[PDB]
Each structure stands twice: as C-alpha cells, then as structure tokens.
Design a protein around this ligand. Structure first.
Ligand SMILES: O=C(Nc1ncc(Br)s1)NS(=O)(=O)c1csc2ccccc12
Ligand SMILES: O=C(Nc1ncc(Br)s1)NS(=O)(=O)c1csc2ccccc12
Ligand SMILES: O=C(Nc1ncc(Br)s1)NS(=O)(=O)c1csc2ccccc12
Ligand SMILES: O=C(Nc1ncc(Br)s1)NS(=O)(=O)c1csc2ccccc12
Lengths: 319, 317, 317, 319
C-alpha cells in the first residue's frame, strides 16, 4: 500500500495516541521543504532574468522554515544556522517542541549546483520555565525526531524517530513525499571514506594514519574508494545508502572541529544511530555531548559501525 | 534582454546563414534533456508506488528517439549501446552525435548529481554512414556540452562562439541564458580525483597531488572535492576553477572515462572556456580514436593548474 | 498567517478532540486530487505521443485507492461503479464517501473545466458495512466539497465550521487557504441552465427564466452562463452569486444530476455558505435516497434567487 | 513520430525556405504562453499568502507577450487589448511582422477560475513607410498566422496557417507543446449554439428567430444544446472541437458588437476558415472588414458552415 510522509506520521501518532503536535510540526516542516526544493531547482528563474521586461536562497530557506514552524503552533524555541540568537516563538503560537536546523546546508557552493540540503533536529522542551535559548542546549540523546531533506538529483526527506529511519521521495508532479525505503539500516562495514584530504598537512596524526590504511591496506583487501561532495547532507546520505565513513574531525587548529553540533552533527548522529550506525567526536558519542553554546562546533566521524570502531582504534593509538 | 537556448541558437544560426539542421538537432536534444530532468527528479514516482492501485534506459531512449526524429543525424553513439546506431535512410541528416544519456547513474541510488554529455560532429566521410564516422578527433567537434541534473538543471553549450550556460526553469520548461561566454579562472584552489587509487598512481600524479597538499612556496594548500560524477566534478571545475583528474590505474590501464562521449565533450568545453585538457601525453582533443567505447586518461581544468601538472609530468619523462 | 488544507483540518480536529480519522480521510483525498489535477493538466502527455519511442477511469482509481488505504472508510460510492465498493476488513474505518471522480469529463475533449465532487457520512450501523450505509439524506453529511480543475485548481471544503477555499499551488503541491468562511451573495445577477431544453421546461422554470430576461420591475436582466460542467457552474454561483438550475421536467421527473455524489455535496456547500438548494418540492438535503445512483432535480445558489424561483414554483401549485 | 510546436514550425519554415523570422516570433510567443500558463495555474501563490512570512494576471500576461515579441527581433508593430496605442518596436529590435493580441482574454471572470486564453494574429508589414499604428490596419484576409492558447482543464495552443490548423497540448512536466491534432477540420453541422441569452430583450429580431428555431425546430427534430462559458477562447474552441455556432451579434444598442476585430474576431475567424468553418458579421466576412481603428469592434457569428448559413438565411429574412 502506498504511503506518504504525512500519512505515515499520522498513523504512528494515532498508534501511540499522541496529541498531534509532532504531526503538525512535521507537516509544517514538509511544506517548507517543498518550497525550498522548488526554489533550489530554480522554478521562476526566468522572471529574475527579465522574461516580462529577491531573497538569496539561504535567507529564503530560513524564512520558510522559521515561518512554517512558528505558525505550526508546535514550537517554542527555534535555533538556526542563520540566526545569532535563538528565536523565541510568540506566546499565542507556542507549542512544546524545540527545533534546531540548518535551512540550506551546503549553499556556500551552490554556484556550481552541488547538492544542498536542510537538516533538522526536534526536542521536547524540558522545563515549564519561560522559553529561552537554554531550552536548545540538550544533548542529542534527547532528540525526539531528526533528519534531513536532500535536494540532489531528486528531493528526498530522511526522517529518523524511535521507530527507525524512513526515506521519502518528493514526487514533484503532485508535491507528496512518497515512502520508498522503510526502516533502513546501514551496512555493518563500507568501502568508501569521505573527508577533505586537501587539508592533510593539518591532520591529526590519527586521521593521517587511518586514511593511509584505507588507501594502503596492510592485508590484501582492496583499498577504499574516496568520495567527498563537500556538502554534508550529500556525503552523509551516501554514507547511509552505501555504507562507509564520513569525517570532519578535530585537529590542532580546530580542536572542536568545524561542523555545528546542534543542527549539523546531532541530527546526522541521530539518523546514523537509528540506522544502526555510529557517530563519535573521537572522545565520545556525538549524541552525549552536552552543549553550552547553541553555535558550538563538534568533531564528527560517522557511518558504518565497523569503520567508526576502526577509526576509534587508531584514534586511541595516538592518545 | 532575456534569452533562451532555442532563441540563442536560432540567432547564432541566422547570423551565420546556416541551413537550420544544427538548430533542429539541438532543439530536439533540449527536449530530451527536459524529459530526462523530469524523470531524474522523480516526477510521477507516486504511480510506481501504487497511488492508483529503468532510468538510464529511459534516458537513452529519449535522446535516441529525439535525435533520430530530428532528421539531423546519421550516426549515433551512446554509452548504453554496444554498437553505433545507424539512422534509417529517410531520417538521415549530416551530423554524428556521441553521448552519455545519464552519466553517473551507477550511483544514483544515493541521489548523486547526474548529467547528460554530448558531442556533435559533421559526418566527414562520403561513404555510407557507419561506426567509423564517429571516430574523429575531438578537435573536429562542431558543438559539445552537458546537462547537469544537480540542485538545479543547467545546460552548458560550447561552440565556436564560446561557452554559454542555460538554467532550466521547470515552471515553464525553458532553458534561460544565465552566464554568457564563460571563461575558467587562470588558476584555481581545488583539486578533484579519486584518491582511493593512490596505491596505483604513476609517480607524476603522486608528486602533483603532494604539491597540492604540501605546497613548496608556502602558499595555502588546495581543497579537495570529488563527487564521483564527472559532470558535477567538471562543472564545479568550470565555475570555480581548479583541476580534475582521472588518471590510469591497474583496473583501468587506458584510463576509465570514455573518450568519445565523456573526455572529448568536456575537453572541448574546457578549451572553449580558455582551459586545458590532457591525457598526460597529448591534448585529449588530438587523440584519434579507433574504438567507439575506448577509454582515456584525462587531466583538465584551469590552464595554470594543467600546465603545472604537465611540468611535473615532464620531470618524470 | 499562511494556512494549508491539511494543517487547517488538523487544527479544527484537535480543537474538537476528534480521533483523527476524518483528517486521514481528507488528507488521502487531497493526495488523490493532486494526482488528478496533474493528469488533467496532461503532465507526461509527451510519453503517450512517443517522445521516448481513461482519465475518468484513472481518476476513479486514484480516489478509490487513496480512500481504501486511508483506514478511514468502509463504503465507497462512485459515479463510475454500479454498486457500492466495500472496503476490505483490515482497512475499514467509520466513514462513507460518495464521489464523482471526474465530473464533466464527457466534454473534456474541448478542455472544459472538470472537477471532483465528494460527500462524507458516518457509517450508519455497527453491522457489516453495506450499500445501505450510503442511503442517507444529505442532512447527515459530515463534510463535503469539490475540487475544480479550472484555469487553476481549487478545493472547496464545507464542514460545520463553514466553507473554505484552498488553491492548489502546483510548484509545491500544497493547497493554500485563500478564502475563509465564505458566504454567497444574498442575490446575484446570473442564471445558469441549458436553455436548449426550453421545449420541455416545467411552466414554472419557463416563467422564472422569463423574469430573468424581461424583469417586471425594470431592473437589469440577468446575464446567462452555462459551462455544462456542474463543478464550474456551481463554483461560479458560489463566487459571484446567482442561480444554477437542472430542474425536473415531464421527460425527466427526477432530473438528470445524481443525488448522492452531485446534488447533495453541492447543496451542503451551498447551505454552509448561506445559500439554498431545492428540488422545487423540498430541500435537496432532505431527500432520503433509495438507490445510490438515483437522480434529483436541483436549483441552488443565492437565497433571494432560490426563494424567488420557489415562489414561482408555488404559483404553479 | 512525435512532433512539437517548435519542431513543426521549423520544418514548415525549412520546406518553404523562409528566413526564420516567423519561427523566432512563434517560438518567442510560445515561451510567453508557457509563462502565462504557469501564472494562470497559480504556481507560487503560496508566496503571496505568506509562506515565507504581485502584478495582476492580465498585466503580467501583457508584459510577457510584449517583452518576448520585442526581444524576438521579428516584430515592428504590436497591438494589444491592454494598450490604447500601438507599440512601435525600437529600431535596434525591429523585424518585419505586426502582431495583434489579447494577452489574457476572459480574465474579467478569472476570480471564478473560468477558462481564459491568449489570442494572437500576425501580419506582414505591407508598406515601406516608417512603422506606425497604420500597419495594423489590415483586413484579416492579410493574416500570415493566427491562433490562440486556451488555459482550460489543460493548456492547448491552436495554430492556424496556410497549411491548416494544428493543435498542440502543453506538457507541463517538460514545458513542450506536443502536436496532438493535425490539420483539424470543423463538422459541417453541429448541435450546440453559444451566446448570452440573458440579453434576449435587446436581441436583433434575426437573432431572436434563429434562437427560436434552435429551441423549437419547425420540423419537430431534436433541439440544439446550449453552452456559453462567457470566455471567448473557451466557447470558440468547443465550437471548433464539437461543431455548432458561436454568436456575439450586433443589436441596436451595440451596432458593431462588442468583441474587438483586430485581436479577437479576426484571429478566430482565420482559425475557423482554415478549419473549413465560417465567420460573419451578418453583413460581411469578418476577414474582409477593413479596420479604421485598432480597437474597433465587430459583430461575430462563427462555427460550422451549415449552422452559420442557417443564421444568415434568418438574418436576411429580417433584411
Ligand atoms: O500525531 C499524533 N496523534 C494523532 N492523532 C490523530 C492524528 Br490524524 S495524528 N501524535 S504525535 O504528534 O505526538 C506523533 C506523531 S509521530 C509519533 C510517534 C510516536 C508518538 C507520537 C507521535
Ligand atoms: O540554424 C541555422 N539557421 C537558421 N535559419 C533560420 C533559423 Br530560425 S535557424 N543554421 S545552423 O543550424 O547551421 C546553426 C545553428 S547554431 C550555428 C552557429 C554557426 C553556424 C550555424 C549554426
Ligand atoms: O483529526 C482529528 N483530530 C486530530 N488530532 C490530532 C491531529 Br494531528 S488531527 N479529528 S477528526 O478527524 O475527527 C476532525 C477533522 S476536522 C474536524 C472537525 C470537527 C471535529 C473533528 C474533526
Ligand atoms: O523559419 C523559417 N525557415 C527556417 N530556416 C531554418 C530553420 Br531551423 S526554420 N522560415 S519562416 O520563419 O519564414 C516560417 C516558419 S513557418 C513557415 C511557413 C511557411 C513559410 C515560412 C515559414
């Protein structure tokens, strides 16, 4: 039987007898994602180039997510890559969830039409205090749902919850996210490694040795292939689909890495763990880091568990 | 003034007082590309999954049928077809087209960018049309380019007048001219290759990549990007500058990419944009092919980067 | 604040603390309507005409399959099906839906506006569901409305909270709330019927129409409009006011339009918008049906217009 | 073999060894029609209603046709329902054709989502004078091409030339007009009449009798059906497809009718004649009226020849 994202979530919600607020949030998020997809694919660009005689994509994407979530009546605190401070939803619109998101990840290189994406993580507000930026400082372990929209060769929404990870393809003919992969699990071990090797001169010695083993295996196994889109959503999604390992690790110049914990590392860590994968900073699971700043950075190494465990073996060798 | 692909080509064609055949070919190709884009973005996927109760093959059929019915072609070479396709006599025209209808589709399971690559030749021999008509060096190309099905769909068209970039507006199904007479940066800051073959690299590639990571002149190291889909990687090289490499390795001793419908079209785009494209030993466009699916090593991109690689290549004889 | 169909319905349902079954129903039907709109606008027609080398039946399949799989329905009555469809046991919910999946499609050859009409009832007994559950008077309707596939696609939804109009935005596949809690004009200036059947008119219809063309009170004559597709004509009546008639005559004592999935949903929309809908003898919503495909006369629209017609009808006993 | 509008016109042009200017014009007009269709179907309406936190359609349609034709390098004089004076294309953009068009016919009732359309008629400039409004004052007999786009349940472009009338369906998934009905001809006699009978009180006596014969045939044969969308392009297209008669006739209050000769009546008259139908004012062929004002009105009666002849017989009975 055919299934859609909204029908799927409604069915899960009715099973669990939830109030519907999470369903309202996710449906609102999906409307935003469809509007982002339409703009990213450049519908209406003819009008910008004078066919009859405004916002940058990252600003528009942020406004779409912000406005659809504010008006969902399901959220109270919103953290965006785009905004220095947490956004507090006005009282008459307040609901129970905190949402951290990157509305258009990878858009810095969108001039070359690289895949881009939207990343989100949804938390339940934990106290009855007046909503504040502190409501977003939860460890990823507290996530209620997380995932990403990938605006690639097609548009796909990957949604992770306690019930697992499910993948929905946007059918642009009808504007519906169609369930096409149910309860997906990552391969126990992959054959692809993904990181920016151009910065090898700055690598931590453990990263240098680990990548060297992928290219020059000590036994007679085949060396790993390399892929690095440079857009986190594309690279993580390939890691999910094909297995393997993705790294944006710490080094001496960047002791906490470069990617943002709240709306890049944690949601992808959560997707990976719900798919049977792993996500580490090198020192601990990404989902166990307790944040102190909504824009703080974190190292991240994630993907197939055998690959992440092997990296942890090499990392500990240099510790 | 706004411009579209078809209007651009008609205006160029009328200035040169051509017969119109190339315009008919390219307009037919653009129709196929729009249908490929629609399928790649999964329009109608709900019907496959039961709402009412093969992509590379479809892409090949769209290009083949649209090019056959244009009356502008006589010989068609596709990555999907073991032998050259000979257009039936009543539909025969003067052009030969080599193409990859959906380049990179082996990894489309992960929604990697994909694309269509094409190169267009005038039939040069007066013999009955056959597979040998597609065996001309890339230097003979009349037009070449690619459609990139990325975050948006863009058609890059290279001709003697230069390189022009057209964005597909899906709201109206029109390719809009957005970048005119494009030129690649003289030198870039990104290198692109599958470093997983580092064990098999010849010493020239090994040294060149080492120079990118550990620059001898204390300059900033290059960043690395490798999508693994040639159209995406080459299009980034065009837009941002830098260098793309797919050298030979033990699995691919004559290289991996196909000369006729991957290396030559991209090499032609690069050269028309003021860039370079070499096998290491010679310009890609000077290779005289003997087999329609033969492979070639390729290094291409910004001229200062390709020249720097060639200096390293010369150091190793 | 922007609003969409699914979000609007979820919010009403949560206020009323409903179980969610009606929302699952309406969301599934919306998915079907978007697939119907896409096919009606001929998306993909190039493939039927050979680029790579039924509509009313497809529409029925879309509605049937989305409602069956909604887990919200148990009995489905369609203009397309001789008997009621009984939803298979594991998929059963409490609602009965009568619908016309592509009303007006007999004239779709000329691209006349077409539409989907629906009315939703609660199951009548806890017995095994059967066709008898569809034999309720329109007064029992829980929700009703229509999608109009016109110059744009619009879904009109009537419930106890009133009538709301949602425009399909094809760029994102979302129904946008654009007209809230609509009320029809008290009196219009347009009458709508097939005057080609004047020879068969009941004398009251003849007299009423004469008053529209030759007003006794020296007011302006009404304009005439008759698309011949019920959804288009009824939607114009809602938006602009006036009167729509498909009345009984001596040859068709019960009219031509179907009571369960044409007249009742439109009468319910009309009454929720402050208009009226009569057979001439009684309110459409008060007819108790005995056959799921039975016909009904219908006169509907602005209250002053319908009351004026009813006064003429009473004049002729 | 599949055929599209642009491919069809290129092939006719190459056969006849034309210069290509008419093809550039028609291709430019097609681009405008696709943009009008997208706006008429309300693509992007979510943005007007606040999804992220402007012109009327008839104004936008006029700007689209005007700008695409100006920039086609194929035109010198443009007459539009929207503009009091003819537009004279600036010298650097001038071509040889004069175009009269109604960019969005029927839009007065678009609030109720009635079918609307674009009507066009194309003339060759006849004089060697500097271009002026006078170049648009040619009788419809001089038309080089004419037709219309109907934005109905689907979008269709009907194109009439000397080779006949051809119908192209817009496939929105790919933005191409697909040839679906070749060399179309109207029925010799139909069963539907089309006019606003609400104004019967003001009818010319000939119109009153003809309509009386349709509803009460003297031979007791079956009456005609009635249809009147009130949007000229919708009513005329149904007349072409199903046969019958469409009337917007003269009366004493409107002795020249109300529809406009240059960009409504002539193009529809030209399509009808190329399809083997008829189009009369009552007194003369629509295509033979020599206009003196670019916005002058004409009565029009058109459709199946046997139906138009019967109207003309009744019209003459009433001298
Ligand atoms: O949505 C609902 N209930 C509904 N009742 C009627 C309709 Br219709 S949906 N609950 S929830 O929003 O909390 C929710 C959405 S997924 C999920 C998974 C586990 C637990 C709860 C949830
Ligand atoms: O298209 C035409 N002629 C036309 N006449 C009327 C119309 Br309308 S198009 N010629 S061509 O096909 O050879 C062509 C297409 S780009 C280009 C660039 C250089 C030389 C020739 C060409
Ligand atoms: O949908 C729900 N409740 C929901 N809970 C959570 C989510 Br999320 S939706 N109830 S209902 O289906 O009966 C319904 C839909 S409109 C309407 C109007 C009046 C009464 C009931 C209804
Ligand atoms: O377009 C062309 N010639 C072309 N050359 C190359 C290409 Br490619 S098209 N001629 S025309 O514009 O005058 C034209 C368009 S339909 C038609 C019908 C009859 C006579 C002329 C025409």
């Amino acid at each position: 039987d055919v299934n859609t994202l909204t029908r799927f979530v409604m069915e899960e919600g009715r099973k669990a007898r939830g109030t519907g607020e999470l369903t309202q949030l996710l449906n609102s998020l999906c409307t935003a994602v469809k509007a982002i997809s339409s703009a990213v694919r450049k519908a209406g660009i003819a009008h910008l180039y004078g066919i009859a005689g405004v916002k940058k994509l990252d600003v528009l994407s942020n406004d779409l997510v912000m406005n659809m979530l504010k008006s969902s009546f399901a959220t109270c605190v919103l953290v965006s890559e785009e905004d220095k401070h947490a956004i507090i939803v006005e009282p008459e619109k307040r609901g129970k969830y905190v949402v951290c998101f990157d509305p258009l990840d990878g858009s810095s290189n969108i001039d070359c039409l690289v895949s881009v994406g939207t990343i989100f993580g949804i938390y339940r507000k934990k106290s009855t205090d007046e909503p504040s930026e502190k409501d977003a400082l939860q460890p990823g372990r507290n996530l209620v749902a997380a995932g990403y929209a990938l605006y690639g060769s097609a548009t796909m929404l990957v949604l992770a919850m306690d019930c697992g990870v499910n993948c929905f393809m946007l059918d642009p003919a009808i504007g519906e996210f169609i369930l096409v992969d149910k309860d997906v699990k990552i391969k126990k071990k992959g054959k692809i490694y993904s990181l920016n090797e151009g910065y090898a001169k700055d690598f931590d010695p453990a990263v240098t040795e680990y990548i060297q083993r992928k290219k020059f295996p000590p036994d007679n196994s085949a060396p790993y292939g390399a892929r690095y889109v440079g857009s986190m959503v594309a690279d993580v999604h390939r890691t999910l689909v094909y297995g393997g390992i993705f790294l944006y690790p710490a080094n001496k110049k960047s002791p906490n890495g470069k990617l943002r914990l709240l709306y890049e590392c944690n949601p992808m860590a959560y997707v990976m763990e719900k798919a049977g994968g792993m996500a580490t900073t090198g020192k601990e699971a990404v989902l166990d880091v307790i944040p102190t700043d909504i824009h703080q950075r974190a190292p991240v190494i994630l993907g197939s568990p055998d690959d992440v465990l092997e990296f942890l073996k090499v990392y500990e060798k240099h510790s």
